[PDB]
Design a protein around this ligand. Structure first.
Ligand SMILES: [Zn+2]
Length: 52
C-alpha cells in the first residue's frame, strides 16, 4: 500500500476492469484520465484517499 500509493503518483495505476489489475505505464499512458487513477487510489488506499 505504501509503494502503491507512491505508484499512482507517476504510474497510471488505473485498474483495467479489476482482473487485468492496475495499469503499469505512466498516468499519461492512454486516455486513462486523472479520474481513472483517482478511482484506484480511492479504491486501494481509502475512500478518503483522494490525493492530488
Ligand atoms: Zn494506463
Amino acid at each position: 500500500p505504501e509503494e502503491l500509493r507512491s505508484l499512482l503518483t507517476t504510474q497510471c495505476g488505473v485498474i483495467s476492469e479489476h482482473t487485468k489489475k492496475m495499469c503499469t505505464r505512466s498516468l499519461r499512458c492512454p486516455q486513462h484520465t486523472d479520474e481513472q487513477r483517482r478511482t484506484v487510489r480511492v479504491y486501494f488506499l481509502g475512500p478518503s484517499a483522494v490525493l492530488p
